[PDB]
């Protein structure tokens, strides 16, 4: 199992400087076939992630030329150059080459204090322990059975940082992780493109935000280019 280690916690900036975020993994990151695939993603405080930097080198559309991925092998290191209010937030690193992929621990960046593809997710759910859940994501401006999509799902707990939890794929290919220990189940409406994570035996571990990501193309190296806006789980 693969462990990635962001190495700065904090590293606080103040606008214009240089900035640099760094992540090792406890394997090889490579696949089989020529490839690293390695993420970063951005949450700005109150909203989901989003897709910075695929395949170790390479900027999302939308994403300024400030941003440049500069890895290699074990190690890896986002660099911004300059700065910008809108730079603000926690950083994760993300391989995406092994069974259970693994998030980083998170970076925050913070100021020096001093002188039309859509995925549309189910409203928050309040139980008691015991129970069970189906949450919902709902893909629009494109086609769940396009070659190359799938849907991954990642769960954030408050101070636990990112997981990942399921997947599933445009032949309706469904994998989990055993950390779970088969209480999860996916589903698929396909007619109503809608996805379904089902969470079976529910303790207060389990109370988390749960965003649903798309996979992206071939072409963005299966990086999660769009993400739902979260759904709230709370168990009493």
């Known amino acids: 199992d693969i462990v990635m280690t962001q190495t700065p916690s904090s590293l606080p900036v103040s606008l214009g400087d240089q900035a640099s975020i760094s992540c090792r993994s406890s394997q090889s990151i490579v696949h089989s076939n020529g490839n690293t695939y390695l993420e970063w993603y951005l949450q700005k405080p109150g909203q989901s992630p989003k897709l910075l930097i695929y395949?170790?080198?390479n900027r999302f559309s939308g994403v300024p030329d400030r941003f440049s991925g500069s890895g290699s092998g074990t190690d890896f290191t986002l660099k911004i150059s300059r700065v910008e209010a809108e730079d603000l937030g926690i950083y994760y690193c993300?391989?995406?080459?092994?069974?259970?992929?693994?998030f980083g621990a998170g970076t925050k960046l913070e100021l020096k204090r001093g002188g039309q593809v859509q995925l549309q997710q189910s409203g928050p759910e309040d139980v008691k322990p015991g129970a069970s859940v189906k949450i919902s994501c709902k893909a629009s401006g494109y086609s769940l059975t396009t070659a190359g999509m799938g849907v991954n799902w990642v769960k954030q707990s408050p101070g636990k940082g990112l997981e990942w939890l399921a997947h599933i794929y445009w032949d309706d290919d469904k994998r989990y992780n055993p950390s779970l220990k088969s209480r999860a189940t996916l589903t698929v409406d396909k007619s109503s493109s809608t996805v379904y994570l089902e969470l079976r035996s529910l303790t207060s571990e389990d109370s988390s935000v749960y965003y649903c990501a798309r996979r992206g193309g071939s072409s963005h190296y299966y990086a999660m280019d769009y993400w739902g806006q979260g759904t709230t789980v709370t168990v009493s």
């Open positions: 395949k170790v080198s």
């Open positions: 993300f391989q995406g080459s092994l069974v259970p992929p693994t």
